[PDB]
From a paper:
Dihydroflavonol 4-reductase (DFR) and flavanone 4-reductase (FNR) reduce dihydroflavonols and flavanones, respectively, using NAD(P)H to produce flavan-(3)-4-(di)ols in flavonoid biosynthesis. Anthocyanidin reductase (ANR) reduces anthocyanidins to flavan-3-ols. In addition to their sequences, the 3D structures of recombinant DFR, FNR and ANR from sorghum and switchgrass showed a high level of similarity. The catalytic mechanism, substrate-specificity and key residues of three reductases were deduced from crystal structures, site-directed mutagenesis, molecular docking, kinetics, and thermodynamic ana-lyses.
From the early stages of refinement, a difference (Fo–Fc) electron density map clearly indicated the presence of an NADP+ molecule in the binding pocket of PvDFRa, SbFNR1, and SbFNR2 with its nicotinamide moiety properly positioned for the pro-R hydride transfer towards the catalytic site. The bound nicotinamide ring in PvDFRa, SbFNR1, and SbFNR2 established a syn-conformation, whereas the adenine ring adopted an anti-conformation. Having both apo- and NADP(H)-bound forms allowed us to observe the conformational change upon binding NADP(H) in the SbFNRs. Compared to the structure without NADP(H), the loop region, 89Val----Pro100 in SbFNR1 (and 89Val----Lys102 in SbFNR2) went through large conformational changes upon binding of NADP(H). Thermodynamic parameters of SbFNR1 were also assayed with ITC for association with NADP+, and it had a Kd of 13.91 µM that indicated a 10-fold decrease in affinity for NADP+ compared to that of PvDFRa as predicted from the crystal structures. In SbFNR1 and SbFNR2, the corresponding catalytic triad is composed of Ser-133/His-173/Lys-177 and Ser-133/Tyr-171/Lys-175, respectively. His-173 is unique for SbFNR1, as all the other compared enzymes including SbFNR2 have tyrosine in that position. In SbFNR1, the 2′ and 3′ hydroxyl groups of the NADPH ribosyl ring were hydrogen bonded only to the sidechain of Lys-177 that was, in turn, indirectly connected to the sidechain Nδ atom of His-173 through two consecutive water molecules. Thus, compared to PvDFRa, the effect of Lys-177 on lowering pKa could be less significant.
Author numbering:
A (entry chain A), B (entry chain B): 11 to 344
């Protein structure tokens, strides 16, 4: 019956979203950059056994190249994103591409004429950087009215500044475009995403949410930075994120942007849980002892108030299947 | 003018609910056991300044004494309840009287013929005691389908077992009665209640939530016992509880029982916050350095799902005015 597009079928979240859509009885069109690279897209053949799944070549840097994948779709899920933070001149090799790639895909949706709603996958990176509140000494519950401070980040350019900036600006641009062209756009703002997916070359948050077990120094540093800034980390199961995305597509009254987040542990509480459940990795929870900081946390109320239900509600349920995914991926050594 | 009854106007929560009802424009009737006790009831005279407030003499052990107080009321808020003590026969001295006193007030509610809805104040004490969930070493989120285990509590009679049993059995019986007589009954289930109220002789949870500042040994043990069991405590501001009670009376869709809770700190997080904001009391957060424990927490979703909004959402807003209240009561030395 209904048809939907997912950009970046080879991606972590995009692969998970394709599965849900097929299981839910959708015809699905997805885009990858190199449909012939079976090292990254071998899962697509398996996913085709669940329902009608069509693969298209596309690149956010090639204008109009999403025209065919998005043609005929009732819903489009803008999941793919550059995400190459790297360095150099981020304003031009990260921020401007991200903004333009988003507008590229948006134009293909207007040219299709069929798209009843675009669902954009942004990030709480576009929510949390509030230099008027961080450093306050007080706790804060941030909601969807909160936007990361682009001006402050451009001025001081702290590490990873271009990530929050890309997300804020691509979302503002996509929203204006949508209003300009009369197309319905809804945005979901995930926290750290945890869980298994079909993608065979996923890295992304799997590396970070598993870093206590692998000892990956970049994942560990990313977790500690979030905790020192917000007094906690925030986690959501990929399958809840996917269901929330589909929920926003299918509920007519859905409107605006939505935090998607479920469990907010401190690092010592997360490490204690992993050490007890997976002792083979030798986690030492005291490695993560930290002061009790004021909590700058994410409000969970918007999706809930509108009738959505998370199914992975405890730490145990959020980590129900990610460890085996990391092992299969090679992210974990055993 | 809509009219509502609040049982136990001398009490902590009862007084704050009276105050809310008046500000919202209700005609309020309330009960106490000695209307002439102006030391204990001075606030009832002060509250007549903000709206119509009539005081009656009633006792839950005295059949029919609530007839006049609930007569002509659209809503009846059953806040009053006998306080817990340690009895040689908690079945005859506590459990059975708690049931009967609840049914006593229920009868007056039908006999009045006007009562559109009864709001019962129970407690998460009727939710949390789940021997499997508490003992299995895993985290859990309890919701409104969870009931404290009466059979287990009777079989093994841990200290204070009769409190949870009294709340479960009286809620069950009140629900049976309401069905059998055609009166709408909604039940609210609060956690530890924090904040200033009009009552001049209030103790209850004010004692417990200030016990870190006061040194009160029974309060500190109460907090520590909850942390030992659940890995945390659960707090809600008395004004949100009062607004939630009113919300459940005025929304015809409301149905069943509702947890009322908002902020769930560990003891060391609560002590750290109090030490930093109230140094004059010499709180030592390290006194609460617990190994931590699996977290058996409360679901907040039911009231949110049905449209209710909490106003005290950070730990600091939950403690926005209770320290001054404990001083005015003499619970806090200075
Ligand atoms: N995972 C989390 O914890 C998290 C949290 C918050 C927000 N998000 C956001 O959710 C989205 C999905 O992220 P993810 O975790 O699934 O990471 P991912 O596995 O790296 O997915 C990124 C996708 O974008 C594709 N892509 C990048 N540049 C492209 C381009 N120029 N043209 C076409 N495709 C391009 C990638 O394909 P190639 O590999 O072929 O380049 C890939 O499929 C992202 O927008 C992320 O920023 C994720
Ligand atoms: N405060 C919390 O953290 C919390 C948490 C969960 C549930 N609750 C429940 O919420 C309700 C209000 O509690 P509270 O904090 O406001 O404690 P409270 O200040 O002690 O109020 C309890 C009231 O019950 C009245 N009462 C006791 N026996 C009575 C009787 N035989 N007849 C008539 N009245 C009687 C008492 O009036 P007298 O002075 O005349 O005895 C008293 O005012 C309670 O049902 C409690 O179980 C409170």
């Amino acid at each position: 019956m209904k048809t939907a597009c997912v950009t970046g079928g080879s991606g972590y979240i995009g692969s998970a979203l394709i599965k849900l859509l097929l299981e839910k009885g959708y015809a699905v069109k997805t885009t990858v950059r190199n449909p012939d690279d079976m090292e990254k897209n071998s899962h697509l053949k398996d996913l085709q056994k669940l329902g009608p799944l069509t693969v298209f070549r596309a690149d956010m840097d090639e204008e109009g190249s999403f025209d065919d994948a998005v043609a005929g779709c009732d819903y489009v899920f803008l999941v793919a994103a550059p995400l190459h933070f790297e360095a150099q001149d981020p304003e031009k090799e990260q921020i401007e591409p991200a903004i333009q790639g988003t507008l590229n895909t948006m134009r293909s949706c207007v040219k299709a004429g069929t798209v009843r709603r675009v669902i954009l996958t942004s990030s709480v990176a576009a929510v949390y950087f509030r230099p008027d509140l961080l450093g306050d000494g007080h706790g804060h519950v941030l909601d969807e009215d909160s936007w990361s401070d682009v001006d402050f980040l451009r001025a001081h350019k702290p590490p990873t500044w271009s990530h929050c900036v890309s997300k804020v600006l691509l979302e503002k641009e996509a929203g204006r475009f949508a209003e300009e062209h009369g197309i319905s756009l809804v945005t979901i703002l995930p926290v750290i995403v945890v869980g298994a997916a079909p993608a065979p070359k996923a890295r992304s948050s799997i590396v970070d949410c598993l870093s206590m077990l692998s000892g990956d120094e970049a994942g560990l540093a990313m977790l500690r930075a979030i905790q020192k800034t917000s007094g906690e980390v925030q986690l959501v199961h990929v399958d809840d994120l996917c269901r929330a995305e589909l929920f926003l597509a299918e509920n007519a009254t859905a409107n605006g942007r939505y935090i998607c987040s479920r469990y907010h542990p401190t690092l010592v509480e997360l490490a204690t849980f992993l050490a007890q459940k997976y002792p083979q990795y030798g986690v030492k929870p005291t490695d993560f002892d930290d002061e009790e900081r004021p909590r700058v946390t994410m409000s969970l109320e918007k999706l809930i108030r509108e009738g959505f239900e998370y199914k992975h509600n405890t730490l145990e349920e959020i980590y129900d299947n990610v460890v085996e995914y990391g092992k299969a991926l090679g992210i974990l050594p055993y």
